[PDB]
């Protein structure tokens, strides 16, 4: 408090508050969760409609970095767009220098070191974003990663980013995710969103579900949930 101005200064007890201040700016964003089954990764983002003039699919938070890699950002949306273009550019140089797809364990290291560099100098500020990284391969399986604004990056089986970070992972861990298929996961992700405050004190919302795994043959794309609409049909039955 006071010395908390620059990102290159220490507190008298030994922490940087400018990193601490940017972490709870991610806290005010809506909840985006991630989960992986035994043969794929399923994303899911609670996204709220601003007033009415939103045109049903604008400014999405499910990006597409590589052929098999996408993001699940939450926080400052404009800061995540510039950070997503770094990961698009980083995966292109690995293709041009080595001739094959980027491993997700190596991709998250290159991004987190880039986020780390904005937490050291007084000229720039730390980012205000946190996001997810999910991929699938036949020699590596499915992985799911997690990057904070400080730059700590390691793997989970399931996660949540937003207001309800604790309130979502309470009921994620009561799932037998080690053996389910990622078609049964999709109807289970939608009830985790709709339990915790979809439109209670808010106005409206719309669910987005991204999708990667064995059924897509390594491709990353949005669900065909528009087809048969089964996520909302199965989750709205949990009213009682």
């Amino acid at each position: 408090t006071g010395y908390d101005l620059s990102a290159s200064t220490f507190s008298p007890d030994g922490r940087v508050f400018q990193v601490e201040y940017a972490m709870k700016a991610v806290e005010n964003s809506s909840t985006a969760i991630g989960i992986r089954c035994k043969d794929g990764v399923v994303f899911g983002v609670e996204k709220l409609v601003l007033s009415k003039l939103y045109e049903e699919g604008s400014n999405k938070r499910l990006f597409n970095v590589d052929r098999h890699v996408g993001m699940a950002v939450a926080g400052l949306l404009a800061d995540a767009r510039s950070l997503a273009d770094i990961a698009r550019e980083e995966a292109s140089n690995f293709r041009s220098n080595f001739g094959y797809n980027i491993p997700l364990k190596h991709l998250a290291d290159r991004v987190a070191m880039y986020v780390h560099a904005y937490t050291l100098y007084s000229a720039v500020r730390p980012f205000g974003c946190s996001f997810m990284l999910g991929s699938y391969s036949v020699n590596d399986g499915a992985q799911l990663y997690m990057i904070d604004p400080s730059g700590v990056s390691y793997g989970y089986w399931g996660c949540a980013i937003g207001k309800a970070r604790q309130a979502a992972k309470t009921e994620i861990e009561k799932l037998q995710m080690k053996e389910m298929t990622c078609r049964d996961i999709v109807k289970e992700v939608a009830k985790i969103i709709y339990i915790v405050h979809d439109e209670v004190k808010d106005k409206a919302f719309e669910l987005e579900l991204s999708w990667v795994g064995e059924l897509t043959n390594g491709r990353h794309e949005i669900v065909p949930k528009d087809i048969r609409e089964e996520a909302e049909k199965y989750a709205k039955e949990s009213l009682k």
């Binding site: 010395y3 620059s6 200064t9 220490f10 507190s11 008298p12 007890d13 030994g14 922490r15």
Partner: peptide
């Protein structure tokens, strides 16, 4: 107390604040 300069008595605090930056 803010940057890496000398204090009186030859001390400097921004590095010995980092010695207990490990302890978190």
């Amino acid at each position: 107390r803010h940057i890496t300069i000398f204090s009186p008595e030859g001390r400097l605090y921004q590095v010995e604040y980092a010695f207990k930056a490990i302890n978190q």
